């Protein structure tokens, strides 16, 4: 869709949970962005 509003929603969600869950979801979103970077090239 827009791929940015969902990213900020996931950012808000991750910051709202505890530390281990936050770091896990942030690295998962980083992996998703890296996979999309791979898909573009």
Partner 1 sequence: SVTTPYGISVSDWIEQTYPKMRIVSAPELSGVQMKAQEPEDALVLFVEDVNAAVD
Sites of contact with its own copies (CB under 8 A): 3-4, 7, 11, 15, 19-24, 26-31, 33-41
Can you give the binding site for partner 1, defined by CB under 8 A?
A: 13, 16-22, 24-25
Smallest gap from residue 28 Cβ to partner 1 (A): 10
Smallest gap from residue 26 Cβ to its own copies (A): 4
Backbone region of residue 18 per phi and psi (left: phi > 0; alpha: psi in -120 to 50; beta: other values): beta
Smallest gap from residue 14 Cβ to its own copies (A): 8
- Give the phi and the psi of residue 30 in degrees, each rounded to 5: -60, -40
């Amino acid at each position: 869709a827009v791929a940015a509003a969902e990213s900020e929603r996931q950012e808000s969600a991750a910051s709202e949970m505890s530390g281990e869950g936050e770091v896990a979801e942030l690295i998962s979103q980083v992996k998703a962005i890296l996979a999309r970077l791979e898909g573009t090239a």
